[PDB]
Amino acid sequence: AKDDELYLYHLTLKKQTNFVHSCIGHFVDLEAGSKREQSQLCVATETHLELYDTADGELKLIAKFQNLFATITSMKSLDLPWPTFLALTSDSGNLSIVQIIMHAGALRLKTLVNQPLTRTTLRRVSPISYMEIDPNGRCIILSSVEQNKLCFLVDYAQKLRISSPLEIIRPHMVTLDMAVVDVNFNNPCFVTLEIDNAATQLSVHLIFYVLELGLNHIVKKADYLVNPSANFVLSLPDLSRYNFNPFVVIGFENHILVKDMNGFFSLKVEIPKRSITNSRHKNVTIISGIVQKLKNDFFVLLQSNHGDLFKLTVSPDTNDRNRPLVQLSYFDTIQNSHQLHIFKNGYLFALSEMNNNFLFQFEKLGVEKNDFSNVLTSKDPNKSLVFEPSIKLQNLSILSQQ
Amino acid sequence: EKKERTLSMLLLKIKNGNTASRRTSMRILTDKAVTFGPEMIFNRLLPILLDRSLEDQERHLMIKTIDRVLYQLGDLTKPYVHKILVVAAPLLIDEDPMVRSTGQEIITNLSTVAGLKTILTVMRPDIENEDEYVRNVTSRAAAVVAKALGVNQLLPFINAACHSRKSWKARHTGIKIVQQIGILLGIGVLNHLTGLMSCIKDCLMDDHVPVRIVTAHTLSTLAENSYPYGIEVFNVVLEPLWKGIRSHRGKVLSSFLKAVGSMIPLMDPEYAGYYTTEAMRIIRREFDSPDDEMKKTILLVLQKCSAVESITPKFLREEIAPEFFQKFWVRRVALDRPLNKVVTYTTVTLAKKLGCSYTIDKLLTPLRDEAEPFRTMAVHAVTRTVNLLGTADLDERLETRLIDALLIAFQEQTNSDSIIFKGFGAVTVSLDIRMKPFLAPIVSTILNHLKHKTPLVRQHAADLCAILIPVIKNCHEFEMLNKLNIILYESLGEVYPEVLGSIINAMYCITSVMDLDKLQPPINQILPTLTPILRNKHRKVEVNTIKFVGLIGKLAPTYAPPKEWMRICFELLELLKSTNKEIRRSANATFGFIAEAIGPHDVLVALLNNLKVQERQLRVCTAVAIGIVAKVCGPYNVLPVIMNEYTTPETNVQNGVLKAMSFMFEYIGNMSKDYIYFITPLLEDALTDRDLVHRQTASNVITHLALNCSGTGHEDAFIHLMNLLIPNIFETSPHAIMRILEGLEALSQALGPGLFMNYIWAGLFHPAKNVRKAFWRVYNNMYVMYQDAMVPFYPVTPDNNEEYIEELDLVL
Amino acid sequence: SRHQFDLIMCLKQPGVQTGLLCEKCDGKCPICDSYVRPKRKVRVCENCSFGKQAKNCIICNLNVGVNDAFYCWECCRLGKDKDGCPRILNLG
Amino acid sequence: AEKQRQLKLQKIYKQKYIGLGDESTTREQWQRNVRNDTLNTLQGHSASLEYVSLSRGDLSIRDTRIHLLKSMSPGYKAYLREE
Amino acid sequence: LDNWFHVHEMLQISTFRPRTILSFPNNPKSILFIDNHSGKKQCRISLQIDGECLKFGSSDHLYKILDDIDCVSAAIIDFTRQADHLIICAGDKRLLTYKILVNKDKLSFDIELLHQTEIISPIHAMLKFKNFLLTAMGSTIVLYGLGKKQLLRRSVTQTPVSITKIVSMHQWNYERLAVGDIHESVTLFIWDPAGNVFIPYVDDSVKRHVTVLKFLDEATVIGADRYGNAWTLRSPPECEKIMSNHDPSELSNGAIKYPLDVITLQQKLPNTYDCKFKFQLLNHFFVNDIITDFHILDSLSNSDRPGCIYMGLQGTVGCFIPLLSKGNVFMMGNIENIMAEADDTFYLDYESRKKNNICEGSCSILGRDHQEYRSYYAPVRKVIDGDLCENFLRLSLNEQEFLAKNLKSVQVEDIIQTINEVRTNYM
Amino acid sequence: KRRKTEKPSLSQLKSQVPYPQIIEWYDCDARYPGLLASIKCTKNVIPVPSHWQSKKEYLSGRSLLGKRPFELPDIIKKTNIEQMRSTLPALDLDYKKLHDVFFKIGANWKPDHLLCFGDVYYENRNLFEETNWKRMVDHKRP
RNA sequence: UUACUAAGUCUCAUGUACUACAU
RNA sequence: GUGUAGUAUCUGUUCUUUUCAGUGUAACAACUGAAAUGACCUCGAGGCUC
């Protein structure tokens, strides 16, 4: 008898286009004998992976790498004191640090060290889905949505060396939005928002962690309870000019906070709102913050659910004392973008979770901090600014779309 | 607070007692050290480990306890700084690396307990110890305290306390602490490189020669720690280092050369040539060292310079080759072990740069010399050069001279010199196709070394013949095969087991290079002669005999009567589970060819009949033989006869069948997929059988079979196999319960959770308090292996649970 | 272990280090003690390495091992490979 | 001895993998594990996350993700009720 | 190999977010688009045929705006061969009928509102039955005819208790149906004339959340999952014999002789076997995307083997090609088996050379095994994954020749031949 | 005590159930009966094999005494090793023969009985009689 | 035309295997 | 062809304080505590019995 047994041949004709992860490192040196430039980006969708360069002000396919056959749940580049190779975490729990290399006549992706963690599946205990690397590249940190957090201390030698994992386990605390604060080599410090899994009331509390290179463990530092409305954390780099004390930006829904590590300074600045507020209007939120610093001027870009792109700068408030202030303003906005990067060049790569990734070069850079009209301050935390969006697109200029 | 003394007895409970009972003492003392008294606590903790009875594990436990006490008693550890500094100092200077590591850890913990000011006030007045050992211990203690309490945290205090001119003691102790910190930190001297060089440069032009030597040693240690890159700070003292090479005298020039040897490889490419030319005025001139401290330093400096890319091979052949060959390349160091190692290493490192032919045609005299002492080192260096470079740089006259020297060294092997034995094979491999024209020389050498009838001599000759067997016999000669086989099978009854193993290895190499009947010993005679040799209990002898019997049936699978091969297989079946894994691998490697040459049906019937005999102490190995005989054509020749052996009514036989089926499946990953359906009617009577043993081992079959056959598309058969398993979940006993759990987990992979779930769900809670405890085991393992995999399969509906999830019903 | 019951395991997050097994225990998958088609080298937490105890056979806990232990292909699919740190703390 | 080890491995596996029904587990305890894992995978796969984002119609996708995160805790229902 | 397509399409953002896409049965390709507004409920309809779109009437606008109409689900129907109607289901739970017009050398689309009908359910799924609209309520399947002043219920079929809602459904030549669920899986129905009802004749094995569903054949069904499983099921030959040898009218009531086992499964397990048959799993696969649309094409660029191509939500398009003969799937299966553990083979070679003198995930770059990743939710059954064997093409000649030595079969060159054969010949 | 006496009647539990005939008297003491009825009565779940609540260790069966030891699958019985080796109270074979039996002859071959989605084997059951039954419904016709 | 189910626990005996241990 | 200790498994045999309450059990079982004595009526059951 003929066996039915339909034999199907699966092919991926066009590969998954929703880009969930990106990294800013400089991986391969191509077409140039000796060149080192930080401008390049590698972007990953789950299985599929791609590597783009710009260097021209216009984005370029470099090579579409072979199918990894896994779910990449986070990807972050690491830079150590060298060719910058990206640390990649996926299902199987393996922390896989891969370097993009030129082999034969094509670019192939080589793996250096993969460390077994959890098991093979997409899990809550699985220390993936939340990942970040020390901006100086000294240590990589993975965490889990709920159970536990692991942080490896990365060291380079004639062969790469991953230090033994540093474990912290909080049973009932569901972790969300890992954001690591840069440091001067003092000590790595990462910040999370822990929502309690088992509780009578909904409680979302931020928590700070300082990994101690001396004692080789992660230390709970400041546990600050904030309203359940909390959304995300971003890292303010220094505030060295104003008054180790890191400061974080906690995006809430209808307003923004920034908090000290020592709790000395908690600044509430209400996020402005559109003029139309069409039909259903949420309290919104900010989906993606990012930081940039040049010439003593550091501003951050935080975009709302409507796509409104905002900046923050810090003012000493010379009249009172030297103390931080927080100043919102308005930009060209954009469509909703999952993640934002900035080259050493003035190019700002906007990775949209919606449809298309597109790159910019900013010139106007936005309104000056002097104007009291359109800019909000931490002077009075209770205040509201209505603004009509601008389709004229003055501040940002689209260079390339994907 | 006398109970803290009893806590010392509790410390005994941490030492003498159970692991949890021992860790409980530390966990309790961690929350009680603050309420115990720093004085008595230290007075009871320090002498406990200070005694010589502190074992390795005891030392580790004491170190952990002291670290916990310091972490609890941070400020209280200040008054006790004079105690641990007097206790941890000698332990840090111990012989074993573990002792020094524990001492350094204890010192770092004591430093981190108090502040840097306490460590400074403790280590500063300790410089009055006029004893060199006490001074070195204090310097190492200060270095360890600075390596953990911050290098720049103690850098200014040390630079302000050592930059004075009190006496030579402080000036020496400063450089000593600097070198100790640079050695303890390691690669962490990059940022503090210039910060330390700024304070260490005060000794490069110091008046006292001792301070200058200490500064040179510290600079060399820093260059070795911060090597190879990062020579920027090295330029701060690079000029004096390159100038004073031929300026100091005795110890000063020695220290300068020792520092330059480390600074040269880390230097750049431009200034490296100038530094080498400036140092050669005092290096090549003083190549002949009156003592060993100068000779070893010069050898290390020459090796480091050869490693550097600055001085090319031309400069080495011009100004480095003649001096190195005159003052160093000689038999004047035939007894200095350290010198014999250092010169050999330097020559091996420099041969790759100066060309192997440049030394292969210049070292053909030290090996052929009558002095066996220097001849051993010469042969070692020659073998190292041949292994590093290879056989390219080999001239005709040079090759002839090397062959003559090797033959003279092997013939004049008056002592047990394994260097020549190890280098003969390397030289034969370097010969390659040239060994054919040089055949009769090595042939006569091996004949004279084999017919000598000396035990160690015959062993070395057999080893050298087995090493160079494939190069000589495989030269397409067909003339030396008989001359080799006649002498090979002659000394077959050697009482020495090592000589017997060497002869067996040589015969195996000959049989691999020779054929039937090209081999000199007849197959019909070597087979019965080698048959009783396999019965010997010698490890190496049996390991070689197994491979010999296997290779005997390689090209020629016949050369035997079937009864002889069957007897050999029956004899070797008992050695398939020996202690040494090499014999276990050789047995399986030989039995495959043995069964391929004998026949499938005969070997299968023999193995089946052997199942009932050889009761279950070594019976399972016979089953492995069934699984080892079904790897040449697959398990389609072993399985049918197995199934009949299961048709046999005897229990123990059926068990051996089911287990043999398990193992034969785990040894084949991709094979069982096609064989799965023929198995299920056998497991039909297995899983249904009343005996918990048959149900157990059948489940063990389903484990491997399901794991390796999972995803093939046989789930419909797997569904059956499971449907018979589910009723066995409630079966008790540890073996049955774990075999059945593992079986069901294997079924989770072949079926996927969904159906396996469906069973687990319909039994998931239940009132029975027993059924529940049983199924929640399977659901625990399922939750361990799969979570996301089970997510879609939770039978949860809005009426099933209150909250449910509002987002599952969303449809777009 | 799979056979001897009283043997206790470690089960922590494995580090970069690789566990050693003695020539006597060579070839066993540390979970199932199987000799077939090994896959990935065992990795143990740093807490099981440190000093002399690092040299011990992760299986028999007594002898000093030269060889690395590998998981089999059945345990690598069962995921017990990634379960945690295999070691035998109690001698049994 | 063997079962006694299975108790310890029950404690360890329960610690790592959180909810594992041992013998007696309340429907509130277990259903919470169900909800937590289902939401966990809905937000965990960028795929299903993108899906729930559109079918729900939220203005941004991270609203859906952090929604699921918040939805993991029981009090989030009353939290929505208090808005 | 990387692209296999070209995409023909200040800041530009449209307030209208698209909803669904439709095409007329009679016109071979005429594609009608329906969008929504983010804001007050609003819609637009943009029809295109041939090169670019159409004008609306004599107006400049190329699209139509529908105020207060939002579309939860929509499908176009032709009640008569000469008339073309459009079907909207509003979130107000109202069924709206329209009429499409093509002006033909004045050519333009003219949409015309006909009727208004209230609906109990949201109507997540509807399709074209013969002469009729075949729609699915939440619980039940209604078959609407064409009435005037509004459309009428011609027949209603009450679902088995298991089905809560119907995500999607599809028909086979008007005789048969496959009806999907949110929670539960596909269940096939048959239309019985003069019985005026669909009778379920088969259940499905396991619980699967089916987003989109199609027919390859009469007896087999394609389906995807909310979670990314791509599967295909087949009715058992025991059922195919019965339905081939019997009329549907005898299924619900009347004499149909079922083997002893089926009835014993009815009284023994009434919940699972209520539909008295079960789908034996035929093909199963996991594509990490969420498949939006399956389409079964009798030929892909004239190729003989008919393929099925799917577009995923996160975006992707992929195909399942049935392999003729056997040694096609034997060679393909062997190549996939090679590339599966190839990383482990490299690790064992790299291990042996270290015994005589590269991590484990070297070749895969990630720890996931192929069979493990592609298995995932449920093990792949007969489907061999070509996306793996394609990676064999990029590897260097040394690596490829290192891998193919495990086969007594043909050389690397013929391997690459068979691999590249699929895109050429099969599409 | 109070919780044991707090239990709702099984018929009170039937109304919550879409397929009430599966629920049984012992479901009254289900600690979460409203839930257990929903799970047990969910579509595709396969009720626990009923050999629990019996202390017979699942096999005391009198029928187990009369079960046949084994029967070769006829395709393997073609290989003739049955005559070569007598299992009931050496035989040279061909590699091509055995290999072809499993592959050439027996590729499409499958066991005749197997079992279905929810088939569960109770102690008193014997599949063989049902195999001859299914085969007989096939051969014999009016 | 008979619409398919019986032994259990205890006690004191018989039947039969077995496990460490010694000549 | 023996002895020491010990185990398992048949089969035979037999039904342990009538009740109450608690534990326990899926329900049993099992376990834990106490104790009615007297009178009458109908066909081992029965009593808004005293």
Q: Describe it for me?
A:
- This is part of a larger assembly, with two copies of chain A, one copy of chain B (812 residues), one copy of chain C (92 residues), one copy of chain D (83 residues) and one copy of chain F (142 residues).
- Chain A is built from no helices and 31 strands.
- With 402 residues, chain A is mainly β.
- In chain A, strands 10, 11, 12, 13 and 14 form a five-stranded antiparallel β-sheet that branches. Chain A has a four-stranded antiparallel β-sheet with strand order 2-3-4-5, with no helix packed on it.
- By secondary structure, chain C is mostly loops.
- In chain C, strands 1-3 form a two-stranded antiparallel ribbon. A two-stranded antiparallel sheet of chain C has the order 2-4.
- The radius of gyration of chain C is 12 Å and the shape is globular.
- Chain D has 83 residues and is mainly α.
- In chain D, 57% of the residues are buried.
- Chain F has helices at residues 10-14, 33-40, 74-77, 81-84, 95-105, 127-139.
- Chain F is elongated and about 75 Å long.
- Chain F starts with 9 loop residues before the first helix and ends with a helix.
- The chains are: A mainly beta (402), B mainly alpha (812), C little secondary structure (92), D mainly alpha (83), F mainly alpha (142).
- Chain B binds chain D through residues 734, 738, 764, 769, 772-773, 776-777, 779-780, 783-784, 787-788, 790-791, 794, 796, 801, 803-808, 810-812, and chain D through 2-3, 6, 10, 13, 17, 19-25, 27, 31, 34-35, 37-42, 44, 51-52, 54-56, 64, 68, 71, 74, 77.
- Strand 1 of chain A pairs antiparallel with strand 25 of chain E.
- Chain F binds a RNA duplex (23 and 50 nucleotides) through residues 1, 25-30, 52-53, 55-56, 60, 62, 124.
